[PDB]
Write a protein that binds this ligand. Structure first.
Ligand SMILES: [Mg+2]
Ligand SMILES: [Mg+2]
Ligand SMILES: [Mg+2]
Ligand SMILES: [Zn+2]
Lengths: 152, 104, 292
RNA sequence: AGUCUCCCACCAAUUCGUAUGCGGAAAACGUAAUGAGAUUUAAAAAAAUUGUUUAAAUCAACUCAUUAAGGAGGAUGCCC
RNA sequence: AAACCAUAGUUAUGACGAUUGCUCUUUCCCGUGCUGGAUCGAGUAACCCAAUGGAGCUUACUAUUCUUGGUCCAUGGAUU
RNA sequence: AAACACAAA
């Protein structure tokens, strides 16, 4: 397939309340100040920055993770149509993650746009993503299979 | 020709065209990309079937016909870059010297 | 190369059973045609139109080239083809060519009336047009019709082997041949010998002398027996074997593996050709450089 | 050869009073310069003629859309 | 009751004989060559045919079933 | 036969 398996990645139900907890950590990090924001934690919230970080400029850290809000009406579907392809072709192990909450547009209301590119080297990032790689890992290349484009 | 056997032939031909659209050279060479794009579209126009818009919009280019792909099988990236808006968000390619603009 | 396309089979209706004497005489006449010299022989089978076609496929061909002609070819060295002539006079509803055309190789017609002639010239998919040289001609043959037919395909056939039957038939045979040659503009003429026994056969020189005495030049006779006979064999062979002239089931490598020439190799119960792998992707494209 | 077109009385004008790229009495007539086009098209595919019956890498071929005649001044390019 | 009129004119355009020329092949000479010359041979094509006259267009022809000129980002071989 | 027709096929 090309997109038939692409929008709906996750099939689990244990995370959402702890998703709320990490969102609370996000607002905790957003409270302090512009510099206190970005000094200890590797966060990007600018589409141009998302592209330039995955372009291949710096290759230091392997585990990179994106968090985007999707599959809810009236969103830039045409524009996030190309971000999973970028997350796959990127040489870094980039785990695209999708907010399964249509009501979680407060993310869109808080930082910039409803997406967040993070680089997992903090040990709490280790703690919470080493348990989510157990949970969700779904990323393929359409050029490989191309068996179910969209028949019947 | 059986129509039940013709449906399978149609699916197989569409899959074959879509696979020929891909592998190495249609990504590399703009000529083969455009030719195979035209062939696939002339083949899908004859079957009286519409194609999905979610792919129709952001699939190929308008000047050459290569798939918009940024950086199992390592290949060449399709597009020069993809900026932010900067006034309006655009996408540029490698093969040709043009860009495609979209507004929010 | 010489081709004889109207060797008659001693059977007219399906209710008839062929005795061993007729098969022995046919084997003898095939040997006779081969000894003096010949290249292609296509035996003929004649049935009428108002008869009831049997609703079979594996019983439509009482020729069995693999059974007895398979006994004869390995010692003879030539090939045989099965052809059928349709005696159609009145356009009745009996019409089942979709089976006999694919079962046989060459399909001809024998019109007696004008309406049958018109329908066989326009709609009926046939290969050769044979007239009853024994009886009288149906009408005054037109020129434009025959020219458009030979430009569209089907050509006329002249059988000099019937003039050896009796005395009273020679005048009618000559009168019909003259009209056919005058109306056909000497373009689509194919010559054949309808002999039932080896004693009524002749040499190519006797044939060309007879036809040059009839009115057709000898060089045209040689050309129509060399190229036109091969072409009318090819058309009737690949119209049934292959599709409508788009995809061929036979691949000619050298000079003997031809769809009309290669007859024992190509399967007939199906249309496949099981050959060992002889085309790879690592071999050099240029045949002058490619060496094994 | 062909089930194509037209001339084979005129009309200072209800009579194609048509100075319209050129030649021509007319013609489903010849040809010249440029741009574009392919059942997604102005129109060819799932009146006559022709077995195949324009094209669809480039060339070649078909179709359509513009360019009114003569004299004078300035600029550019060539022999000079 | 005629207007009856064709450098073919109304189902006609015959019959053979002789001469030159044209295309290839088996030969000899001067200067290489020369729509240079002479013997041994094969072929003179096809579409097809007027019925009142002229022009335009399209469609059939030329493979040992005569020929001619040019072109080709067609391929095949060789030199730079 | 040819030649003719807002025929007929
Ligand atoms: Mg005439
Ligand atoms: Mg006529
Ligand atoms: Mg006429
Ligand atoms: Zn391009």
């Amino acid at each position: 397939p090309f997109t038939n398996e692409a929008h709906m990645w996750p099939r689990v139900h244990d995370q959402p309340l702890i998703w709320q907890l990490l969102q609370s950590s996000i607002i905790n990090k957003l409270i302090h100040i512009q510099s206190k924001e970005n000094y200890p934690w590797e966060l990007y919230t600018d589409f141009n920055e998302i592209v330039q970080y995955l372009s291949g400029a710096h290759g230091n850290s392997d585990p990179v993770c994106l968090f985007v809000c999707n599959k809810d009406p009236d969103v830039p579907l045409v524009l996030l149509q190309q971000i999973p392809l970028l997350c796959y072709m990127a040489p870094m192990t980039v785990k695209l993650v999708q907010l399964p909450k249509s009501a979680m547009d407060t993310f869109k209301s808080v930082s910039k746009y409803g997406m967040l590119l993070l680089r997992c080297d903090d040990r709490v990032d280790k703690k919470f993503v080493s348990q989510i790689q157990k949970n969700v890992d779904l990323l393929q290349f359409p050029w490989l299979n191309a068996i179910k484009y969209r028949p019947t | 020709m059986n129509k039940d056997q013709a449906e399978k032939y149609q699916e197989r031909s569409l899959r074959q065209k879509y696979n020929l659209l891909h592998v190495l050279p249609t990504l590399n060479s703009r000529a083969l990309s455009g030719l195979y794009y035209k062939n696939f579209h002339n083949s899908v126009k004859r079957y009286q079937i519409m194609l999905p818009e979610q792919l129709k919009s952001g699939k190929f280019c308008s000047h050459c016909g290569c798939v918009y792909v940024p950086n199992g099988d390592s290949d060449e990236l399709g597009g020069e870059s993809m900026e932010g808006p900067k006034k309006c968000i655009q996408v540029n390619c490698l093969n040709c010297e043009k860009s495609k603009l979209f507004e929010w | 190369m010489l081709v004889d396309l109207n060797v008659p089979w001693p059977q007219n209706s399906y209710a008839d059973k062929v005795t061993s004497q007729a098969v022995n005489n046919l084997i003898k006449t095939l040997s006779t045609l081969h000894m003096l010299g010949y290249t292609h022989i296509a035996i003929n089978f004649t049935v009428n139109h108002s008869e009831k076609f049997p609703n079979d496929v594996k019983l439509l061909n009482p020729i069995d080239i693999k059974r007895r002609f398979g006994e004869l070819m390995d010692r003879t060295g030539l090939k045989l083809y099965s052809r059928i002539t349709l005696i159609i006079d009145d356009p009745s509803k009996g019409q089942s060519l979709s089976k006999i055309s694919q079962a046989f190789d060459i399909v001809a017609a024998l019109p007696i009336s004008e309406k049958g002639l018109t329908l066989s010239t326009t709609n009926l998919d046939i290969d050769l047009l044979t007239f009853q040289y024994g009886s009288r001609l149906p009408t005054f043959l037109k020129h434009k019709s025959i020219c458009s037919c030979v430009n569209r395909g089907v050509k006329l056939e002249i059988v000099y082997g019937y003039a050896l039957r009796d005395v009273q038939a020679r005048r009618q045979f000559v009168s019909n041949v003259r009209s056919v040659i005058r109306s056909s503009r000497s373009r689509g003429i194919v010559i054949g010998s309808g002999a039932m026994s080896p004693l009524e056969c002749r040499n190519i020189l006797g044939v060309t002398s007879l036809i040059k005495n009839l009115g057709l030049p000898s060089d045209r006779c040689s050309k129509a027996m060399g190229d036109l006979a091969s072409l009318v064999l090819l058309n009737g062979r690949l119209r049934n074997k292959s599709h409508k002239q788009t995809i061929v089931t036979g691949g000619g490598s050298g000079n003997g593996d031809d769809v009309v020439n290669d007859v024992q190799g190509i399967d007939d119960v199906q249309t496949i050709k099981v050959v060992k792998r002889s085309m790879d992707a690592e071999q050099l494209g240029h045949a002058s450089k490619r060496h094994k």
